[PDB]
Every structure is written in structure tokens, then in C-alpha cells.
Amino acid sequence: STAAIAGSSAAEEMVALLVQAGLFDTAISLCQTFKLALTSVFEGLACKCIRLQQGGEAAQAEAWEWLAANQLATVITTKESSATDEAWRLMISYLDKYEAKNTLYHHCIINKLLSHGVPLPNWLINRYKAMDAAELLRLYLKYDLLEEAAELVLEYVDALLGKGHQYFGIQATSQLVWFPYSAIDHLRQALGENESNQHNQAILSKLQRKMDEYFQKLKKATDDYKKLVQ
Amino acid sequence: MFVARSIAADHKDLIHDVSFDFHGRRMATCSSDQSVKVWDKSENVNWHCTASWKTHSGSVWRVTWAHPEFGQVLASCSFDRTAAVWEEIVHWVKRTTLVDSRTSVTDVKFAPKHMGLMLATCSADGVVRIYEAPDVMNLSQWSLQHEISCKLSCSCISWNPSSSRAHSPMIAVGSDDSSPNIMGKVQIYEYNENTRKYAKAETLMSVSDPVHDIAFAPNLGRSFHILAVATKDVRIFTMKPLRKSGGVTKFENHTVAQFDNHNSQVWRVSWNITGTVLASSGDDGTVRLWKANYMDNWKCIGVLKGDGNPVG
């Protein structure tokens, strides 16, 4: 039926039907030719991955199949991988090769992953922290992951202080010190609504104390560097 | 017939840890002079040194041989937050230097072969990092996949040797922190496939004393598992999984043996190939072997003197 429909249609329509059927690599190529963005295909791939994460056996086998229609770069002997993990790697590879604006692709993947919730893996987390930590924080608040948000904030503070700055893309002659204050504000507001969990209050207090310490040290370093330049 | 062999070590400095290979013919001896020597066994029992090289400035703790199916792969953790992977070329050659850890990597353990080549490193910060090599031909590429926070200073790690598909991968993590009040220093982490991440399953609150070494016993086609914990006293536990999902299957723990016969701190615990005889070390300088009889009663079967002679 979609065959007849393609018979008399246009590019956007083709892309739509291909994504629905599951032929993703072809959709990718078509998007590139007409300069259409790759968002659709990345989102479709993310959907399949979420489906497999929590899905039945038949879905898993069909998944293996459509992977052969696409192109898996290498063969890995891991028994634990199964079809689902193979589809994950395919998506990852397609992303690396056909990449454009970073914000767009990562965004759409993360959004689709949080269709019904998912614990992101550590490699992805680290890559994102090294590129766009602010966007990483915003998606947390979108689905109310306050504790993870606080952990990220603490790690970013540590990176700005020189401890593992490489993992956050912080270059540091002090110059760069961009701190996302608005996000911290929103986090505090979310924490101070229900005000029921004692543990939450405790973690908030700890974070605040640590931040205050950070700021005093920042002020000392400030005075020092100002004196130096002068 | 217990024999005594005196092989001149040819080591300029104190030897720390030795480890046999899978088939029992190749062994690596790391020493305090920052050198790792590989001794191989000929047709005659005589051992011969084949390769000697310097590895790390930091104090090398453990050396782990991988399954021969993947090749002659070694691993060495050190004080300087590094975990190097070694491979011969036909001389041992460093392929990677895992340095994601911010604190001294204390223990390194290779994953059972059925999962793949997944080196695991625990560090003093309290984070267990499980890396993974995608292709065995290229050993320079290692991608971190799972980081497990334990909230306590890790001292030792041990995988579950079980290859049963029903038993999801499990890793045990100890805590050497001399906490005055905090108990539960042995934590078991299970892999939930649905969340594709490691989650805590059971915490052995009974162990309230610093844990020096943990070791799983081969399952041998049994419903329950056995974990040996080396603290101030040797303790053997039995974790029977409960009935049956969306989450970790809770466990039921029973302490079946507790031996304080060492009268000192138990530092090391290791099982034999079939998990019947457990050995233990101590400050007394003796290695006591423990074996269970037909009535499941563990008893000491051998003690050793410092000069090398056996205790009669």
C-alpha cells in the first residue's frame, strides 16, 4: 500500500513511510539529498531502541533482521549483546558518520529515550558533560530527576576547580567560569515545594554549603589574579 | 606427598603477588623493584624466566590473567591510578592504560568469558568501573560502559563464576574503610537487563568489620551461592535466591561458618578448582585449609610453619 502511495507522492511523504516501516538507512540518505534534517531518522532509531529495552521476543528477532538490512560496521562475539544491543551500536555508528549540529541529534535522542524513562549510560553521560552540560541539566528538570541534577552540579563545580575538567570540556590565567545559575534556581524551587523528604532537604543543605565554600575560594582566587594582572 | 621446592627467585626486591594461568603452566611474578617476570614451565617441572620488564612507578597490587580463548592477555593495577593491558608480539607490549579512576585502583578482575572481555576496576573513591573491549584483535581500544558508585572505599571485587542464564551477572564489592559504626561492608550488585544498569541487590550487614578480601565459590549446579569474606575472622555465607520480574530478586542470607582459629586478621581467601577446599592466610604466618565433610561441617585440615615445614 505504501508502495502505491510512494508511486504518487513527494520527498517528505517518502521519508515518513520509510521511517514507519523501519527502513532507516534509506531515510537517512534521502534526507541528506534534499538537505532535509536528520532529526526524523534519529528519533525513529531511538524509538526502536526504547521498544527493545523493554520488549517481547518476537520484536527482538525482527530487530535482528532489520539490522542486516542496515549496515553493522563490525562483528562482536559477545553473547550478552543480543539483538537489542546490536541495534544500539548501529544507531551510534550512523550518528558518528552522518553528524551535523550536535545540539539537534543528541537532543532528539535523549528526548525520545525519555519516552517513559530510562537510566542513561555512563559513557553517554560523560560525552554530554564534555560538550553541553547545560542541556544535560535541562532534560533532567523536564522529567524531575533532582538528585541526578545535583550530582551533575557537584561534578561541574569540581571540574571548574580543576578536578577532572577534561570530562566537562572546561579548559581551565583564569578566564572561563560560566556557571548556570538559573538552573540552580529552578532546582531549589522544585526542592522547596513538597518539602516532605528529610533526605532531600539534607542533600540540598550539603550542596549549598559546598557551593558557598566554592564561592569564597573563587573570591580569593579573584583577588589574587586581579592583583597579579595589575 | 607434600614437597618443598626452592626456586631461586632472581628478584632484587620483595615479591608481592603471583598468579597462575588458566591451564596451570604460566605464572606472573610482580615485585617491589617495579618489574614483572613471566615464568614458564617446561616438560620437566623446572621453571624458567622468559620475559622481564618494568611496568609502573606506582606500587603494583594485583595481576590477572585472562582466559586463553582471548589470547595471552595480562592486567596490572597500581597505586598511580592506572590499569595496563599487556600482550606479546610474535616481549610484552602495553596496549592501553585505563586512567578514568581518580583514586588508587586497588583490585582488577576479568569478567567470566561468557560475558566477554570486560575488565573491572575498583578504586578507593568508591567507584567500580566496568570497561569492555569491542574487538579482541585491537586491544588498545577500551570503552567504559558501567560505573557503579558504592559510597564506600572499595577494597576487593569478585565476579560470579556461574554461567547459568538464569543467574544474572553479579559482582561483589567490599569495603576496607575502618568505619566505627557503619556496617554492611559487603555489597552485592546485580545487573538488571530492563534498565541496562547495575543495581544493589543485597548488603551483608553482618560484616561490620573491615573487609580485606571476598571470593565467590563455583556454583557447581546448585540453587544457592557461596561467598567467602575475609575480615578479622573467616566467614562463609549462603545466598539463596527467593521465589519468582521488574527488579532485583531479593536474597536470604545465612552464616554457615565462622572461623576465628587464625586468632589474627585474615588477609586472603581462595578456593580450589572445584570449590571444596578454601585456604586462608594470616598474621601468624600460617595457611589453614578448610574442608567440609559429608555432614556439612567445616574443619581445618592443614597448618604450615614459617620455615616452610608443615605443622604436625
From Swiss-Prot, chain B:
Give the quaternary structure: Component of the Nup107-160 subcomplex of the nuclear pore complex (NPC). The Nup107-160 subcomplex includes NUP160, NUP133, NUP107, NUP98, NUP85, NUP43, NUP37, SEH1 and SEC13. Component of the GATOR2 subcomplex, composed of MIOS, SEC13, SEH1L, WDR24 and WDR59. The GATOR2 complex interacts with CASTOR1 and CASTOR2; the interaction is negatively regulated by arginine. The GATOR2 complex interacts with SESN1, SESN2 and SESN3; the interaction is negatively regulated by amino acids.
Give the gene symbol. Answer: seh1l-b
Q: Please indicate which superkingdom the organism of origin belongs to.
A: Eukaryota
Q: Which GO terms describe its cellular component?
A: GATOR2 complex; kinetochore; lysosomal membrane; nuclear pore outer ring; Seh1-associated complex
Its predominant location is: nucleus
Protein name (Swiss-Prot/TrEMBL) = Nucleoporin SEH1-B
| Annotated source species | Xenopus laevis (African clawed frog)
- Tell where it localizes: Chromosome, Centromere, Kinetochore; Nucleus, Nuclear pore complex; Lysosome membrane
Extract one GO BP annotation from the record.
mitotic metaphase chromosome alignment
Q: Which Pfam families match?
A: WD40 (PF00400)
Keywords, alphabetical: Cell cycle, Cell division, Centromere, Chromosome, Chromosome partition, Kinetochore, Lysosome, Membrane, Mitosis, mRNA transport, Nuclear pore complex, Nucleus, Protein transport, Repeat, Translocation, Transport, WD repeat
